[PDB]
Amino acid sequence: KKILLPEPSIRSVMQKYLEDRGEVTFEKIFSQKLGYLLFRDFCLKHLEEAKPLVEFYEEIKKYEKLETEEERLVCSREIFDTYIMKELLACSHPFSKSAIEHVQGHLVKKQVPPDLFQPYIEEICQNLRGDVFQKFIESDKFTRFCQWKNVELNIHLTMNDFSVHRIIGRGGFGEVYGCRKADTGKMYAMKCLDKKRIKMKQGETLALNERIMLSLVSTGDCPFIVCMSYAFHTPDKLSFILDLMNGGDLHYHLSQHGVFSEADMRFYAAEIILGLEHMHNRFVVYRDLKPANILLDEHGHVRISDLGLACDFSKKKPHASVGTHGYMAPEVLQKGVAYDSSADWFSLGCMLFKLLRGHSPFRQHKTKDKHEIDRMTLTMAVELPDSFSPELRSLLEGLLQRDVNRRLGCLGRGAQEVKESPFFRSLDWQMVFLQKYPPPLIPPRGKGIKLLDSDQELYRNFPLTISERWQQEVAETVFDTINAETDRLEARKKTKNKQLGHEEDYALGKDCIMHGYMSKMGNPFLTQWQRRYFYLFPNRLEWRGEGEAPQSLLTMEEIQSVEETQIKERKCLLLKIRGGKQFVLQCDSDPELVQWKKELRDAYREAQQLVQRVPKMKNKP
Amino acid sequence: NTASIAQARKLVEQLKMEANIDRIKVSKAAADLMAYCEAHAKEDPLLTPVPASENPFREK
Amino acid sequence: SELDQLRQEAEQLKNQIRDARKACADATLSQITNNIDPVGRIQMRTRRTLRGHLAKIYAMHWGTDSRLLVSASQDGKLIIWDSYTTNKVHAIPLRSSWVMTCAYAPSGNYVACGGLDNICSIYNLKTREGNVRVSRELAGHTGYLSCCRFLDDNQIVTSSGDTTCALWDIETGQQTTTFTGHTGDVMSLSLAPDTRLFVSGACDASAKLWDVREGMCRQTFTGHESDINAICFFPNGNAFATGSDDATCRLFDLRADQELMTYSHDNIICGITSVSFSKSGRLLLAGYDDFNCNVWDALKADRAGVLAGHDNRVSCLGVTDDGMAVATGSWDSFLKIWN
Ligand SMILES: CC1=C(C(=O)Nc2ccc3[nH]ncc3c2)[C@H](c2ccc(F)c(C(=O)NCc3ccccn3)c2)NC(=O)N1
């Protein structure tokens, strides 16, 4: 009912699984939250040669985050005096002249921007990259990494892994519920779409799309988009695990509050712009921007949600009329006519107008006719109420330009154009990013269709986990405690072994290729599963129970093939043998499955190759 | 290798060594083998089964 | 052409050799032994089964005490056994899983083994600290070690799939002498009792007699139609036998320089993996890929016995220096002791 790390033996397999994938590089490990965590714990405490580096890395990373110039003056002094000056005074400062001079010069012009020490960062990485990384790998902190990756790479989520709570949104294909992921305790939304409801309304592409789109925007922890951490499914349902937003959406609040003053609108627009920015930097157009796709959190800060109708424009620019009538640009509404980013900037205007006035600019006199709103979006320019301040007035006419070349944001520098509108003169965008502005509104406490294999083939690749989201979830919840517990559990197994005499490690001082737990059938007539510790050598696969040494084996010669097979609806390895015999293996996790398949195959091929060149060893007719 | 002049000389010198040995008659060699066998047939436990008493692998 | 001349000259010499041998073939061993008595039922039985190897056994050797033996296996261990008790005196996990030969040093202090690692590894049995360590890794072969026999505790001879054999000085690890001449993987060797000569049998279907101290081949015996997998000196150092994939053993005499006898039968169709003589030379013992060890009458050429208690190939055998016993080792993981 909570995460359990595999034993340290898991290293034999994971290190090889990772190596085959090229993942064992400082680059690929350092840039993972758990990897960084582990590498630093190693440097600081288990290697007094790299402590100063990482300590120096961390002081700079803290510096980057300092909000004010007053503060960056003070911290740069310290960092310079402690990790540069002193290190120079002891001829022990492995960095460029360029690095030192870049910082030095800047300090005396008291010139302290947030990127001040970036030059060192790249070089601190240079110095950790080599022998330090290499030792880290040899250490038990990298073993710990392997333990944590194996869990990562073996995530298979089911509804059962969440504690589902109350419904918080609904539309065409399903519902959103708030939930707790049992594992870690972390609160999320779960969006469940019904595959039946889907098939009916022929929006299989649209649910697929929302996943692919989420997968594009969910990295980098954007506090203005409702991002994804996982997706899985059941035979009935698509499930996205998303950021939980308890505050409901703007459209509801619009109608509760009445219209919003410009200043209130400004808060919303800012945060939204940042989210648009994030998506646009990832070549995604949201397309459906409007109050109801902006959710609020418990405090009033907002985020863009539901990327169903969003679209990649990394390669093919879209052309189709997709959005909500009232908010769609001309290039949108015009078919065959293509469009990128632009349409969101226009919807932004439309939506912004709508928060000021209660209706889309292009919805006149309570009109409920779509072809009318199409018409006067394409046809008529924007009559803007006497009351609109000139700056607002500038912004809205800037955003709602019909010509894309004349529209604010679309003129080459993206969101920055919009951030620079005089309507936002008063904002420090770092403070917006930091969510430091006080929100305007604080949410007050609240048929017989069939499913063929050809349906469920379309969802074959819906499941994923966003690695970074999972590591962060883990990082901030159970990582420390679990490392302590697991450290502690390891120290006891090593206590039992100096006393009960299981000291020598069978797998060393020989040519063992790999070892680890698998389970076989040991009862031929009964077919239950026995967990044993296996050791693969180039000419044989040995295993042992606990306590005693290995007393059975297969030879790479005996093995004719290794293939996947389904047993108790679990993917297992099937080994065909010499006699027309058979041997079945279950591995404890996907990566172990993958690696035992590869290595067994590799080892039996090579061994047969080799034995055949050897007259004493081979078969004679 | 078979096209090597040094290897071919080495082969010839070797066959010269092998050709120029003193050989005895097969009758003589064979008699000497026969005599050996008869001279040590006594010392050979696999030749007459021998009593459990003297043999470490029976009854012990 | 110099090369063509040397080639014909080699032929002439092969012919000169053939004729010198035929001038010696005045009678046969079989004629000469024609009136000695047969040997009767050689009725041998398993006294011990040595159970412990977890996979095929490839080779074994008796210590000179006629008591301990070493065995080498597909499981990547040497087991040193006390055949009197079946107690494993030592079980030695090897560094390479691909072992295929092994040898007990006369002194009893050392064993050796090796295989597809191309190395002859010398383990020391009696360390002063009471532990079994590799004392030497004799490296230099460019092919698998197929056989190895110590001369004493500081010199050892090896044969290889690199087609050579070699003599080593243990203390230094040097390959002091190289025995070249074979053109196929060398599979087996056998020291003479005096240890001043040894013979080797190879995949070239030929056996060669070598002088240890001078590093040359003295004689080359042919006549097998296929690989020689095994070879053994007759106990007086003047003949040896071979066992081949052609399904025959053969006795060759040094001083007559030629084959004296074939040991075969229309029924026995499988290759021989191993040969040994009884103490008196009277009996030739041969392991066969049909799971048996035939006992032959060396002087008469008659099948005299059979050892039949292995479920796979008999891959190695050996007789004790005291002559009390025969060990067979098999692809079925067991050694058996017989008499
Ligand atoms: C944002 C939004 C809805 C919603 O509540 N989504 C949502 C997403 C993540 C969340 N975290 N916390 C609340 C929360 C809420 C809500 C909604 C909720 C669940 C749904 F299944 C649907 C829905 O089915 N929309 C049709 C659709 C879906 C996917 C692709 C294309 N078309 C809509 N309706 C809506 O117009 N917009």
mmCIF file of C-alpha atoms in Angstrom, chain C residues 66-257:
data_model
loop_
_atom_site.group_PDB
_atom_site.id
_atom_site.type_symbol
_atom_site.label_atom_id
_atom_site.label_comp_id
_atom_site.label_asym_id
_atom_site.label_seq_id
_atom_site.Cartn_x
_atom_site.Cartn_y
_atom_site.Cartn_z
ATOM 1 C CA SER C 66 46.064 -43.539 -5.993
ATOM 2 C CA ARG C 67 43.567 -41.868 -3.611
ATOM 3 C CA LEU C 68 42.675 -38.218 -4.422
ATOM 4 C CA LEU C 69 41.602 -37.061 -7.789
ATOM 5 C CA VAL C 70 40.707 -33.789 -9.477
ATOM 6 C CA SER C 71 37.823 -33.374 -11.878
ATOM 7 C CA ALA C 72 36.876 -30.492 -14.205
ATOM 8 C CA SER C 73 33.345 -29.623 -15.264
ATOM 9 C CA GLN C 74 30.924 -27.538 -17.282
ATOM 10 C CA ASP C 75 29.885 -26.051 -13.909
ATOM 11 C CA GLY C 76 33.092 -24.040 -13.732
ATOM 12 C CA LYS C 77 34.586 -25.887 -10.767
ATOM 13 C CA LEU C 78 37.420 -28.267 -10.071
ATOM 14 C CA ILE C 79 36.452 -30.744 -7.421
ATOM 15 C CA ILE C 80 39.281 -32.507 -5.653
ATOM 16 C CA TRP C 81 37.923 -35.826 -4.352
ATOM 17 C CA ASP C 82 38.974 -38.473 -1.847
ATOM 18 C CA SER C 83 37.634 -41.559 -3.664
ATOM 19 C CA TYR C 84 38.043 -43.685 -0.509
ATOM 20 C CA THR C 85 35.304 -41.644 1.267
ATOM 21 C CA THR C 86 33.612 -39.682 -1.599
ATOM 22 C CA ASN C 87 34.421 -36.587 0.430
ATOM 23 C CA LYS C 88 35.130 -33.428 -1.448
ATOM 24 C CA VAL C 89 38.454 -32.306 -0.142
ATOM 25 C CA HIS C 90 38.232 -29.050 -2.131
ATOM 26 C CA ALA C 91 35.764 -27.516 -4.513
ATOM 27 C CA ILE C 92 37.340 -24.788 -6.519
ATOM 28 C CA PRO C 93 35.257 -22.145 -8.180
ATOM 29 C CA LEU C 94 37.120 -21.206 -11.318
ATOM 30 C CA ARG C 95 37.492 -17.813 -12.870
ATOM 31 C CA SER C 96 36.391 -19.064 -16.266
ATOM 32 C CA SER C 97 33.345 -21.194 -16.732
ATOM 33 C CA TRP C 98 34.901 -22.818 -19.853
ATOM 34 C CA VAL C 99 37.314 -25.268 -18.244
ATOM 35 C CA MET C 100 37.935 -28.498 -20.078
ATOM 36 C CA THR C 101 41.080 -30.090 -18.687
ATOM 37 C CA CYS C 102 42.835 -30.623 -15.367
ATOM 38 C CA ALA C 103 45.766 -32.319 -13.725
ATOM 39 C CA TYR C 104 46.960 -33.424 -10.337
ATOM 40 C CA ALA C 105 50.568 -32.542 -9.660
ATOM 41 C CA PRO C 106 52.584 -35.692 -8.695
ATOM 42 C CA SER C 107 53.457 -34.129 -5.339
ATOM 43 C CA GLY C 108 49.754 -33.656 -4.531
ATOM 44 C CA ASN C 109 50.417 -29.942 -3.762
ATOM 45 C CA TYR C 110 48.958 -28.418 -6.874
ATOM 46 C CA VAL C 111 46.330 -28.948 -9.464
ATOM 47 C CA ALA C 112 45.996 -27.299 -12.804
ATOM 48 C CA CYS C 113 43.171 -26.786 -15.218
ATOM 49 C CA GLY C 114 42.042 -24.479 -17.958
ATOM 50 C CA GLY C 115 40.092 -24.330 -21.182
ATOM 51 C CA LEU C 116 38.528 -21.739 -23.450
ATOM 52 C CA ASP C 117 40.217 -19.005 -21.487
ATOM 53 C CA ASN C 118 43.416 -20.173 -23.130
ATOM 54 C CA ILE C 119 45.239 -20.254 -19.772
ATOM 55 C CA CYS C 120 46.669 -22.997 -17.560
ATOM 56 C CA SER C 121 45.790 -22.054 -14.033
ATOM 57 C CA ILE C 122 47.801 -23.496 -11.234
ATOM 58 C CA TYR C 123 45.947 -23.738 -7.948
ATOM 59 C CA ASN C 124 47.936 -24.364 -4.730
ATOM 60 C CA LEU C 125 46.308 -26.780 -2.366
ATOM 61 C CA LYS C 126 48.486 -26.593 0.776
ATOM 62 C CA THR C 127 48.967 -22.888 1.528
ATOM 63 C CA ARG C 128 50.406 -21.992 4.958
ATOM 64 C CA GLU C 129 47.178 -20.062 5.691
ATOM 65 C CA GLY C 130 44.981 -23.106 4.847
ATOM 66 C CA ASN C 131 43.317 -21.731 1.681
ATOM 67 C CA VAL C 132 43.070 -22.579 -2.015
ATOM 68 C CA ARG C 133 44.358 -19.888 -4.271
ATOM 69 C CA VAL C 134 45.428 -19.525 -7.832
ATOM 70 C CA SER C 135 49.182 -19.395 -7.648
ATOM 71 C CA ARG C 136 49.788 -18.988 -11.417
ATOM 72 C CA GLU C 137 47.927 -18.111 -14.587
ATOM 73 C CA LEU C 138 50.115 -19.430 -17.338
ATOM 74 C CA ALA C 139 49.236 -17.422 -20.383
ATOM 75 C CA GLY C 140 50.603 -17.642 -23.894
ATOM 76 C CA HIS C 141 48.485 -20.098 -25.764
ATOM 77 C CA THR C 142 46.364 -18.457 -28.401
ATOM 78 C CA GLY C 143 43.885 -21.283 -28.254
ATOM 79 C CA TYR C 144 42.045 -23.267 -25.649
ATOM 80 C CA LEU C 145 44.035 -25.405 -23.263
ATOM 81 C CA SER C 146 43.057 -28.944 -24.037
ATOM 82 C CA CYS C 147 45.319 -30.864 -21.655
ATOM 83 C CA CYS C 148 47.938 -30.337 -19.087
ATOM 84 C CA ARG C 149 50.323 -32.510 -17.052
ATOM 85 C CA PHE C 150 52.812 -31.434 -14.387
ATOM 86 C CA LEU C 151 56.389 -32.846 -14.575
ATOM 87 C CA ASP C 152 57.008 -31.744 -10.986
ATOM 88 C CA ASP C 153 55.783 -28.723 -8.896
ATOM 89 C CA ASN C 154 57.677 -26.159 -10.923
ATOM 90 C CA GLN C 155 57.221 -27.432 -14.483
ATOM 91 C CA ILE C 156 54.113 -28.312 -16.483
ATOM 92 C CA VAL C 157 53.311 -29.245 -20.078
ATOM 93 C CA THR C 158 50.148 -28.119 -21.836
ATOM 94 C CA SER C 159 48.511 -28.804 -25.192
ATOM 95 C CA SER C 160 46.253 -26.416 -27.047
ATOM 96 C CA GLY C 161 43.773 -25.762 -29.820
ATOM 97 C CA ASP C 162 46.398 -23.347 -31.156
ATOM 98 C CA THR C 163 47.904 -26.610 -32.414
ATOM 99 C CA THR C 164 50.980 -26.384 -30.151
ATOM 100 C CA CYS C 165 51.972 -27.810 -26.850
ATOM 101 C CA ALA C 166 54.301 -26.032 -24.507
ATOM 102 C CA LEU C 167 56.516 -26.451 -21.430
ATOM 103 C CA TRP C 168 56.200 -23.968 -18.557
ATOM 104 C CA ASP C 169 58.276 -22.795 -15.640
ATOM 105 C CA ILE C 170 55.754 -22.186 -12.930
ATOM 106 C CA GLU C 171 57.647 -19.882 -10.562
ATOM 107 C CA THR C 172 58.157 -17.372 -13.373
ATOM 108 C CA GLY C 173 55.120 -18.136 -15.552
ATOM 109 C CA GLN C 174 57.266 -18.411 -18.666
ATOM 110 C CA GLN C 175 56.556 -20.605 -21.644
ATOM 111 C CA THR C 176 60.043 -22.094 -21.672
ATOM 112 C CA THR C 177 59.571 -24.381 -24.701
ATOM 113 C CA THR C 178 57.099 -24.524 -27.560
ATOM 114 C CA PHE C 179 56.290 -27.745 -29.303
ATOM 115 C CA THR C 180 55.092 -26.977 -32.810
ATOM 116 C CA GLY C 181 54.408 -29.297 -35.712
ATOM 117 C CA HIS C 182 50.790 -30.365 -35.398
ATOM 118 C CA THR C 183 48.398 -28.820 -37.920
ATOM 119 C CA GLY C 184 45.170 -29.355 -35.991
ATOM 120 C CA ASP C 185 43.966 -28.579 -32.531
ATOM 121 C CA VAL C 186 45.966 -30.636 -30.044
ATOM 122 C CA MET C 187 43.592 -32.501 -27.808
ATOM 123 C CA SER C 188 45.626 -34.635 -25.535
ATOM 124 C CA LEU C 189 48.982 -35.449 -24.144
ATOM 125 C CA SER C 190 50.678 -38.066 -22.078
ATOM 126 C CA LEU C 191 53.974 -38.013 -20.276
ATOM 127 C CA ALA C 192 56.304 -40.905 -20.419
ATOM 128 C CA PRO C 193 57.140 -42.529 -17.124
ATOM 129 C CA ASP C 194 60.724 -41.089 -17.213
ATOM 130 C CA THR C 195 59.095 -37.712 -18.162
ATOM 131 C CA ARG C 196 61.838 -37.044 -20.669
ATOM 132 C CA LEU C 197 59.387 -37.599 -23.518
ATOM 133 C CA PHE C 198 55.679 -37.106 -24.086
ATOM 134 C CA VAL C 199 53.150 -37.759 -26.826
ATOM 135 C CA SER C 200 50.302 -35.647 -28.123
ATOM 136 C CA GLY C 201 47.270 -36.423 -30.243
ATOM 137 C CA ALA C 202 45.530 -33.892 -32.449
ATOM 138 C CA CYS C 203 42.735 -33.084 -34.788
ATOM 139 C CA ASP C 204 45.163 -33.664 -37.670
ATOM 140 C CA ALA C 205 44.613 -37.388 -37.008
ATOM 141 C CA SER C 206 48.276 -37.767 -36.099
ATOM 142 C CA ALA C 207 50.144 -38.376 -32.877
ATOM 143 C CA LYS C 208 53.590 -36.942 -32.142
ATOM 144 C CA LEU C 209 56.348 -37.949 -29.742
ATOM 145 C CA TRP C 210 58.266 -35.058 -28.188
ATOM 146 C CA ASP C 211 61.470 -34.806 -26.194
ATOM 147 C CA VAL C 212 60.803 -32.478 -23.286
ATOM 148 C CA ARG C 213 64.340 -31.285 -22.643
ATOM 149 C CA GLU C 214 65.099 -30.523 -26.285
ATOM 150 C CA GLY C 215 61.770 -29.258 -27.496
ATOM 151 C CA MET C 216 61.482 -31.201 -30.748
ATOM 152 C CA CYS C 217 59.254 -33.832 -32.252
ATOM 153 C CA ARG C 218 60.981 -37.182 -32.789
ATOM 154 C CA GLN C 219 58.267 -39.201 -34.457
ATOM 155 C CA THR C 220 54.881 -38.858 -36.038
ATOM 156 C CA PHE C 221 52.293 -41.592 -36.091
ATOM 157 C CA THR C 222 49.453 -41.601 -38.553
ATOM 158 C CA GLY C 223 46.663 -44.055 -39.496
ATOM 159 C CA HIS C 224 43.592 -42.813 -37.660
ATOM 160 C CA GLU C 225 41.004 -41.546 -40.101
ATOM 161 C CA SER C 226 39.918 -38.716 -37.835
ATOM 162 C CA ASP C 227 40.696 -36.576 -34.747
ATOM 163 C CA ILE C 228 42.763 -38.053 -31.989
ATOM 164 C CA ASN C 229 40.928 -37.167 -28.805
ATOM 165 C CA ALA C 230 43.032 -39.146 -26.395
ATOM 166 C CA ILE C 231 46.378 -40.566 -25.856
ATOM 167 C CA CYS C 232 48.225 -42.640 -23.228
ATOM 168 C CA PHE C 233 51.702 -44.081 -22.732
ATOM 169 C CA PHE C 234 51.986 -47.772 -22.295
ATOM 170 C CA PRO C 235 53.608 -48.217 -18.861
ATOM 171 C CA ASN C 236 57.136 -48.922 -20.068
ATOM 172 C CA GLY C 237 57.442 -45.823 -22.162
ATOM 173 C CA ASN C 238 57.869 -47.577 -25.541
ATOM 174 C CA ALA C 239 54.440 -47.497 -26.983
ATOM 175 C CA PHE C 240 51.359 -45.486 -26.535
ATOM 176 C CA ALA C 241 47.791 -45.643 -27.507
ATOM 177 C CA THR C 242 45.337 -43.211 -28.966
ATOM 178 C CA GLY C 243 41.576 -42.983 -29.203
ATOM 179 C CA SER C 244 39.940 -41.267 -32.136
ATOM 180 C CA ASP C 245 36.653 -40.041 -33.555
ATOM 181 C CA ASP C 246 37.092 -42.808 -36.150
ATOM 182 C CA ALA C 247 35.960 -45.208 -33.436
ATOM 183 C CA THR C 248 39.227 -47.110 -33.057
ATOM 184 C CA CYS C 249 41.975 -47.136 -30.538
ATOM 185 C CA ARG C 250 45.441 -47.901 -31.797
ATOM 186 C CA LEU C 251 48.698 -48.973 -30.327
ATOM 187 C CA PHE C 252 51.810 -47.542 -31.755
ATOM 188 C CA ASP C 253 55.337 -48.656 -30.934
ATOM 189 C CA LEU C 254 58.111 -46.128 -30.567
ATOM 190 C CA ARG C 255 61.081 -48.290 -31.416
ATOM 191 C CA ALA C 256 59.321 -49.883 -34.446
ATOM 192 C CA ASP C 257 57.919 -46.522 -35.271
#
